[PDB]
């Protein structure tokens, strides 16, 4: 019985109860996805490629129906023609919003990439602002909760859509649970039932037994190289929601008069189907992994957020080293414990629009994939490193144990 | 020699000189494309796939540079993410136009699919109109020429872009040659040099030694399942033009902030490169075929448009039988002389937004591809059938001779 | 707390200790495969396709080196040019064996497919017998152990190779553990160290911490649509062993004078790499699944083999219903609880060379894949059904719970 | 007109009549292939992938039937599993031959790669010799014709198969026309009608209106990265012949008991069908190019073989410069006028089993493909360079004119 092994025996026993809970959620979600395959009568011919126009591609259409069934929506859009999560989100915004309309984000300022999209960052690019669509965001209370009086003050007759970002992303606040989201929807719908509630669902898929579309969200969007891709999707994004709303997204994604009826699937179907099927289980690996990281690092006297015993709604997990050297050594050890490009150590790197260098471990099968184990953060006080994902719980245990042995 | 063989010997001698000119154009164009590959140092690594976000895909970028080199533009956008010619065109319009801007098509009303796009066909789908962008079309003169006085009267200070459709499509007018297009461009630029000239270039690629971007067009667009795909591209579209304009198109195709810097190529690069290399030559097969069809049908007392000895700028070829039966029999024979689904008899079919039944031969490798031999037309007087494309001149001669033998 | 749920709470607590052991093995094996990726410096460019001859395909070569590293061999052969497990095995036999040589199987008669291969079933097909290569097999003792005196009697100067089939397959004997195999190797090597020991390793990969190549096997072969494909490999087989021996296999697989240096990888690399990486973990799911099936069925008074508490060396798991109806209802429920073709119920089916109908549940992503959950058996006393595989432990729990609710 | 242009005008007029005959052959062959697609009811579903074992792949089977129809054989084996022409040929030899049998090549010693296969090149690799199969070759007469008395003397009762190599390869003799091959076949069959006649058909496909299987050959084989692949097949080989013989080949390609009934097609079907459809026409480009090269070089006082006005049966074309410098400069110029890796300067290179350095131009889409334009030769007197292939006649004219301009 070694050193670190002793610590592991202890910490693993400690977290076992919560890990078991994660497995209960995974079985529930696995059944849910299986039921969705089944109600849509998925067959092996549904993996066949389409070419050219992609008209009447039943494989593509069936997959979208499977997505809609799982999220409990009327319709979905899940294609490689949606190139990412950001692209999926932008498709929702431009798809629905029209000149004179206003978008209100209530979960505080959303992730930085949306900056140019809404138009508060650049010019001439074709932002919402360029198309006469208004945008604002309501900051969170200091405690990370929604500032309801502030939201109330902001909602006007011109407010067409309310934006909710489930995951904290890089923001210093807790990710919003489905219960918290339900409360937000109830609140806005009580003010105006016609207001469209959109939730940026990235990293939350299959973390709970429920999704935002089950607590009244009208439409949601996410990334296929995160949770729902199950580690297999090579690219893409998804949209799920009301039929009228998904129709609009489709016209934005292709063109009016064609919309979602068109777009060749080529060779992407099998990986999307199989990835979705495995997604509940693979998500469970990343969650189990996060709790392990949180428990182990805390044990080694390192600050963890969230806490190993925190409620979980997404995959996000950070650890604050309060040490530049410790942070870099850890991120490098994570790369060194990765399957792909393990020998290409990350270093402090310049990043456009940022005053601080960033460090990123990304030894993955798919470029930029996040359900896979990665690590990153800005190199500045308090030296917070995001260490999350993992295709297997085994991989996370191995990598984190080695990262500890290497930096602490 | 059989009878038909005797007619062929005569007709083939008659058109030889023109077929030779087509071959001369093919060699010029083949050299143009080769020089572009060399200039851009095309390598086998340029065929490699990219996954995830598709950042720093040199293969994708190099393909784009090759397109730009051939079309003699600063920039190009060429990728699987563009699902068709219509999508390419829409991307140009929404990419460049903004609220208060006006689009003026000068080549008469453009192809029907653009109806919904501009907003004269529906409501609420996110048309140019829905986004406060103005549109109009100047009808052609009765002889099919541009109505210059009408054009002059409709150009205002708010006219941001001029639209030109090279190919006649289904319009009862001749396709516009590069020389004619040059006249148009010179004219509108004389009125306002800052006006953006866009040419829908479908079916015209490699038919002449020059493209519209060489006669003053600022930006062009087309489909990869037509000419530039060389029969090999399974899907896609292209945009080529000035860097500023192509940048704007990129933000529309993806999102602001990202643009053309993202989008996984997956496995599509090789077919696009190889198809483009083969495009000048495959285009020539389709043109030689067109001339054969025109000359043979005329010889059999059937009306052809264009005439065998007409100037050619695109692939479009029609024959008018003034007989329902002959028209149907001929189209059926074309399907029967096609490689794929030869046994699937075309019959009068309903087409959305069409009072008349249509008949179509589409026995192709790629779904809806048109550089391949196809035949189609609405079932009504004067019973005009479009018989065009052909991956090989041999295929067209065989199919057409048999179609004649089966219907006349 | 429901009926069956109560039974599950009980049985799951009971099997927990062994399941945990399976997870320890999985973590060890995950580390082992990770270490193999790392020592071979696996990078994202190693997933790139090769075409034509496939000469100097580093992606293909690196993968084979990763396989060799994991199995602790000098060399391996793992390509889609090996179309299956049977093909892999036959390649080993014809690769090494020459006229006058004799093959001796000591684990009793091997699986039926090898019948034509060795030549004890047909004629003129090019069996070992057709090529003047001898074959025999030593039956097991009644207790399922190796009959060592019988083996000793059989080994002659002409015995070039000894065959060992690790997995019981359909045979009514226990699968041979690695320790048992070590004993066999020691025994034959003591008689003649020059005798080549070959192990058919199908279904045993990653079930223990060790493989036969670690207890002295010279060469091994298996299927990529079983354990090592991790559920992702679309086809294939592998060979691993001594360099001289793998060289010979390569000449058989391609041609002499070329061998393994050639063969295009096309698009198969990523799935093979990623599948191998996930294989320890996915294998663990199928093992955990088997123990669950064994424990649950036994609880419902149904005979299980192996027992939930048996030592495990492969994925094989059966249950004997002593009831035709119960057996068929169970197999059908397994299909109905599968992701693909769930609505296509299996029925009693004729099978060539068999007196009895067979039933097979195979609602899988990959045609004929076995790491995925399936069920099959011959429809005859005692109505033994093989219920094994599972990409996730969750899937197996769900499917088995439903199969019980449906047939018992 | 420039000078070179003046020479071209003259030379092109001179060869026109022969180029026209090539086009006539192209049309005949195109019709032959089209009729085969029709006869076999080729459908778009025939392009669908198969996974796993590849059982009941109708697309794969239909492709095989199309090949058989074109070659006028009972059966064909055409698949990605055959990695080359050599592999196809080896499969035929080991598939049919058995211990005590003898193979007699009558067209002199065949291509070098077959050396190891037959067993006159190495030891222990599993050659025909290692498997107790006899081999011999009858040298050609000095004029390159068959030595009939020597052939008669070497045919015995143990002569199971007669080998005929259509193409000269690197041998200093003319390629054998179908008429010549017919003479050979008639002769050997007169000696023994039960003798199996095999023709290595590489580079000869679609060059004449007839194939060897139409002049008595029992079985033939070739490469898909040459003629029948139409420039599109990324890998592979074919075997066509009598059902009994093709059956035997199947058991060798896979295993006895299984044969041709197995092997996943994955994503290779479409390119194989489309390539075969285009093959007659692409072949014609390469032949027209060959004639252009022969006539142009001769016009410039360089020795050509074959001569511009020679009978053609395959793609092979050489030119002898009697100058190292000119030879090297010309090959370099061909690479520089190639689409892929144009910038990668060919230089004298070592070649295993060759005392002399070789130079090669291989700037192709598919690695090692030869229907595409390439150039190669050993660097030694009389400095003979093979300059052949070409996906388009335009490409050859451009490359060759530039090569002339750069070296002469
Ligand atoms: Ca001017
Ligand atoms: Ca005779």
- What are the DSSP calls for C315-370, one per residue? S--EEE-S-HHHHHHHHHHHHHTSSSSTTS----B--TT-SS-EEEE---SSTT-S
Q: Do B262 and A98 touch (CB under 8 A)?
A: no
At C274, which helix (H) or strand (E)? helix C269-299
The domain boundary, picked from D235, D264, D293, lies at D264
Q: Residue D378 region, left (φ>0) first, then alpha (ψ -120 to 50), else beta?
A: beta
User: Looking at the structure, do residues A139 and A204 belong to the same domain, yes or no?
Assistant: yes
Both A113 and A214 in one domain: the answer is yes
* Spatial separation of the C-alpha atoms in residues B399 and C366, rounded to whole Å: 40
Ligand 2 centroid to Cα of residue D151, in Å, is: 16
C127 touches chain D (CB under 8 A): yes
Q: Which residues of A touch B200 (CB under 8 A)?
A: none
A to D CB pairs, distance under 8 Å: 8
User: Which residue reads 């892929």 in tokens?
Assistant: D340
Asked if the Cβ–Cβ distance from B27 to D398 is below 8 Å, we say: yes
Residue B152 to residue B138: CA distance in whole angstroms: 10
Q: How far apart are CA D317 and CA D393, in angstroms?
A: 14
Element (H, E) at A222: strand A219-223
Do B9 and B70 fall into the same domain?
A: no
Which strand (E) or helix (H) includes residue B250? helix B243-253
Phi-psi region of B257 (alpha: psi -120 to 50; beta: other; left: phi over 0): left
Give the C-alpha separation, A217 to A73, whole Å.
10
User: Are C278 and C393 part of one and the same domain?
Assistant: yes
Rounded to the nearest angstrom, the distance between the alpha carbon of B187 and the centre of ligand 1 is 7
Domain shared by B21 and B160, yes or no: no
Phi, psi (5° rounding) for residue C186?
-60, -45
User: Does D342 contact B31 at a Cβ distance shorter than 8 Å?
Assistant: no
Q: What is the total residue count of chain B?
A: 408
Q: What is the dihedral sign for C-alpha D247, D248, D252, D256?
A: positive
Two tokens, residue C67: 């396989």
Q: D11 and D296 in contact (C-beta within 8 Å)? A: yes
Q: How far is CA C173 from CA C109, C169, C207, C295, C317, in A?
A: 11, 9, 18, 20, 12
Sign of CA dihedral B370, B371, B374, B375: positive
D361 touches chain B (CB under 8 A): no
The b-or-e profile of A73-112 (16+ CB within 10 A means b, else e) is: bebbbbbbbbbbbbbbbbbbbbbbbbeebbbbbbbbbbbe
CA distance C48 to chain B (A): 6
Q: Which token pair is A130?
A: 């360029």
Identify whether the C-beta of residue A68 lies closer than 8 Å to the C-beta of residue C364: no
Bridge partner list, B135: B103
Structure tokens at A261: 């009826």
Other beta carbons within 10 angstroms of residue C350's beta carbon come to 8
Contact B71, B204 (CB under 8 A): no
Q: What is the domain extent for residue D296?
A: 2-50+265-408
Q: Is C147 exposed, middle or buried, given 0-12, 13-18 or 19+ CB atoms closer than 10 A?
A: middle
- Burial class for B84, CB neighbours closer than 10 Å (0-12, 13-18, 19+): buried
CA D362 – CA B174 distance, rounded (Å): 44
A–C: how many Cβ contacts below 8 A?
Answer: 112
| Cα A8 from Cα A22, distance rounded (Å) | 19
Contact C392 A278 (CB under 8 A): yes
A49 interface with D at CB cutoff 8 Å:
yes
Please indicate if any CB of chain C lies within 8 Å of the CB of B267.
yes
Nearest Cα of chain C lies from the Cα of B340 at a distance, in angstroms, of 25
Q: How close is the nearest chain D Cα to the Cα of B165, in Å?
A: 30
Nearest CA in chain A to B268: A266
Q: Who's near D220: CB < 8 A, 6+ residues apart?
A: D71, D73, D198, D199, D200, D201, D211, D212, D213, D239, D240, D241
Task: Sort out which chain A residues have CB atoms less than 8 A from D267's CB and list them.
Answer: 49, 267
**How far is the centre of ligand 2, averaged over its atoms, from the C-alpha of D189 (Å)?**
6
Closest C-alpha among C72, B161, B231 to residue D230:
B231
Ligand nearest to the CA of B189: 1
List the structure tokens of A129.
């602002």
CATH number of domain containing C238: 3.40.640.10
Residues 6+ positions from A241 with CB-CB distance below 8 Å: A73, A74, A75, A76, A213, A217, A218, A219, A220
Which residue among C52, C98, C115 places its CB closest to the CB of D130?
A: C98
As a whole number of angstroms, the distance between CA D210 and CA B262 comes to: 51
Distance CA D158, CA D161 (A): 9
Q: How far is the CA of B188 from the centre of ligand 1 (A)?
A: 9
Q: Which ligand is nearest to the CA of B190?
A: 1
Number of separate domains in chain A: 2
Edge-to-edge order in the sheet of strand D159-165: D75-79, D237-241, D219-223, D196-200, D159-165, D102-105, D134-137
Q: Given CA atoms D361, D367, D370, D373 in this order, what sign does their dihedral have?
A: negative
B105 plus B143 within the same structural domain: yes
Centroid of ligand 1 to alpha carbon of B291 (angstroms): 36
- Say if residue D210 is in the same domain as residue D279: no
B14: exposed, middle or buried (Cβ count in 10 Å: 0-12, 13-18, 19+): middle
Q: Of C188, C254, C217, which is closest to residue C55 (Cα–Cα)?
A: C254
Tell me how far apart the alpha carbons of residues A317 and A297 are, in angstroms, rounded to a whole number: 11
Which of the ligands is closest to the CA of residue D187?
A: 2
D60 to chain C, minimum CA–CA distance in Å?
Answer: 15
3-state helix, strand, coil in chain C (%, to 5): 40, 15, 45
Tell whether D211 and D345 lie within a shared domain: no
Helix/strand/coil percentages in chain D, nearest 5: 45, 15, 40
A190 has binding-site annotation:
yes
Question: What is the number of the ligand closest to the CA of D183?
Answer: 2
The residues, ordered by sequence, that sit 6+ positions from A119 with a Cβ below 8 Å of its Cβ are A127, A128, A129, A130, A135, B256
- Taking CB atoms and an 8 Å cutoff, what residues of chain C touch D113? 255, 257-258
Output the DSSP codes for B117-151: HHTSS-SSS--TGGGT-EEEEPPPPTTS---HHHH
Beta bridge partners, C197, equal: C162
Residue contact D98–C130, C-beta within 8 A: yes
D49 touches A at CB < 8 Å:
yes
Angle between helices B393-407 and B3-39 (to 10 degrees): 150
Contact C215, C185 (CB under 8 A): yes
CA distance C237 to C92: 11
**Measured at the alpha carbon of residue B172, what is the angle toward residues B171 and B178, in degrees to the nearest 5?**
75
**How many Å is the Cα radius of gyration of chain C?**
21
In terms of Cα–Cα distance, which of B58, B80, B267, C44 is closest to A82?
A: B80
Task: Tell me the nearest-neighbour CA distance from D343 into chain B, angstroms.
Answer: 7
Neighbours of A341 (CB within 10 A): 20
Of D230, D264, D298, which marks where a domain is finished? D264
In angstroms and rounded to an integer, the radius of gyration of the C-alpha atoms of chain D is 21
Dig out the tokens for B307 from the structure: 């005439």
CA–CA dist A80, D406 (Å, integer): 47
Determine how β-strand C159-165 pairs with β-strand C102-105.
parallel
Q: Report yes or no: C360 and C349 within 8 Å, Cβ to Cβ.
A: yes
A159-165 β-sheet, strand order: A75-79, A237-241, A219-223, A196-200, A159-165, A102-105, A134-137
Give the CATH number, domain containing residue C24: 3.90.1150.60
**How many C-beta atoms surround the C-beta of residue B402 within 10 A?**
18
- Three-state secondary-structure class, residue B299: helix
Distance D195 CA to ligand 2 centre (A): 12
Tokens of B319: 């024959």
- Largest Cα span, chain A: 68
Q: Where are the alpha helices (DSSP H) in B255-358?
A: 269-299, 324-336
* Residue in chain B nearest A81 by alpha carbon: B81
D-chain residues within 8 Å CB-CB of A271?
Answer: none
Q: Tell me which H or E stretch contains D274.
A: helix D269-299
Report the C-alpha gap between D228 and B316 in whole angstroms.
31
> Of C264, C279, C299, which residue sits at a domain end?
C264
Q: Which two tokens stand for residue C113?
A: 């497919």
- CA torsion sign, B136 to B140 to B141 to B147? positive
Burial (CB count within 10 angstroms: exposed 0-12, middle 13-18, buried 19+), residue D210 = middle
The verdict on a CB contact (< 8 Å) between C234 and D264 is yes
Extract the tokens encoding A345.
Answer: 């150590």
Nearest residue in chain D measured CA to CA from B33: D339
Q: Is C254 on the interface with B (CB under 8 A)?
A: no
In angstroms, the Cα distances linking D256 to A126, D81, D178, D259 are 64, 16, 34, 6
Could you give the 3-state DSSP secondary structure of residue C115?
helix
The answer for D 278-307 residues in CB contact with B (under 8 A) is 278, 280-281, 285
CA of D81, closest CA in chain C: separation in Å? 5
* CB of B324 less than 8 A from some CB of D: no
Cα separation of D168 and D181, whole Å?
Answer: 13
Ligand found nearest the CA of B186: 1
A167–chain B nearest CA distance, Å: 20
Pair (C302, C177) in one structural domain: no
Angstrom distance (rounded) from CA C210 to CA C32: 10
* Min Cα separation A351/chain C (Å): 23
- Backbone phi and psi for residue B291, each to the nearest 5 degrees, phi listed first: -75, -35
Q: Do B49 and C49 touch (CB under 8 A)?
A: yes
C201: tokens are 């390793």
Q: Are D351 and D332 in contact (CB under 8 A)?
A: no
Distance CA B365, CA D274 (A): 7
Q: Do residues B45 and B65 share a domain? A: no
- Interface contact B342-D280, CB threshold 8 A: no
Q: Could you tell me which residues are beta bridge partners of residue C304?
A: C319
List of residues 6+ apart from A52 with CB closer than 8 A: A264, B225, B234, B235, B366, B367, B368, B369
- Solved by what technique? X-ray
Contact C256 D126 (CB under 8 A): yes
Q: What resolution (Å)? A: 2.1
Radius of gyration for chain A, computed over Cα atoms and rounded to the nearest angstrom = 21
Residues C165 and C271 grouped into a single domain = no
Cα angle for residues C84, C85, C90 (degrees, 5° grid): 100
B109 and B257 inside one domain = yes
Q: In whole angstroms, what is the distance from residue B93 CA to residue B234 CA? A: 24
Contacts of B113 in chain A (CB under 8 A): 255, 257-258
Q: For residue D342, list chain B residues with Cβ-Cβ distance below 8 A.
A: 37-38, 41-42
Ligand nearest to the CA of D186: 2
Strand ranges across the sheet with C196-200: C75-79, C237-241, C219-223, C196-200, C159-165, C102-105, C134-137
Task: Output the CA D13–ligand 2 centroid distance in Å.
Answer: 44
């Amino acid at each position: 019985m070694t050193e670190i092994q002793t610590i592991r025996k202890k910490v693993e026993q400690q977290i076992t109860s919560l890990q078991n809970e994660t497995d209960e959620i995974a079985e529930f979600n696995q059944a849910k996805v299986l039921d969705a395959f089944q109600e849509n009568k998925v067959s092996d011919f549904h993996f066949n490629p389409s070419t050219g126009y992609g008209y009447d591609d039943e494989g593509r259409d069936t997959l979208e129906r499977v997505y809609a069934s799982v999220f409990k929506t009327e319709a979905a859009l899940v294609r490689p023609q949606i190139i990412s999560g950001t692209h999926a989100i932008s498709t929702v915004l431009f798809g629905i919003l029209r000149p004179g309309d206003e978008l209100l984000y209530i979960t505080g300022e959303p992730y930085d990439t949306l900056e140019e999209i809404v138009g508060i960052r650049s010019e001439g690019q074709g932002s919402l602002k360029d198309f006469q669509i208004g945008y604002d965001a309501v900051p969170l209370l200091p405690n990370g909760e929604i500032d309801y009086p502030a939201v109330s003050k902001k909602i006007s007759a011109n407010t067409k859509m309310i934006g909710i970002q489930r995951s904290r992303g890089y923001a210093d606040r807790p990710s919003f649970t489905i219960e918290k989201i339900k409360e937000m929807v109830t609140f806005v719908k009580n003010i105006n039932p016609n207001i469209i509630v959109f939730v940026d669902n990235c990293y939350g898929e299959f973390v709970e037994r429920i999704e935002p579309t089950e607590v009244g969200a009208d439409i949601i969007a996410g990334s296929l190289i995160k949770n729902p891709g199950g580690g297999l999707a090579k690219t893409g994004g998804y949209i799920a929601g009301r039929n009228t709303l998904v129709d609009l997204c489709g016209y934005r994604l292709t063109t009016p008069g064609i919309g979602r009826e068109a777009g060749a699937s080529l060779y992407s179907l099998l990986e999307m189907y199989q990835g979705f099927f495995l997604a509940p289980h693979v998500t469970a690996q990343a969650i189990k992994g996060a709790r392990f990281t949180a428990a182990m690092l805390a044990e080694f006297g390192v600050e963890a957020d969230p806490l190993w015993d925190a409620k979980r709604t997404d995959l996000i997990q950070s650890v604050s080293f309060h040490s530049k050297d410790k942070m870099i050594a850890f991120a490098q050890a994570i790369q060194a414990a990765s399957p792909v490009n393990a020998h290409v150590l990350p270093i402090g790197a310049y990043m456009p629009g940022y005053e601080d260098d960033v460090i990123m471990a990304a030894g993955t099968f798919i470029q930029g994939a996040s359900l896979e184990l990665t690590a990153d953060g800005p190199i500045r006080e308090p030296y917070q490193l995001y260490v999350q994902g993992g295709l297997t719980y085994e991989h996370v245990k191995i990598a984190v144990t080695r990262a500890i042995e290497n930096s602490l």
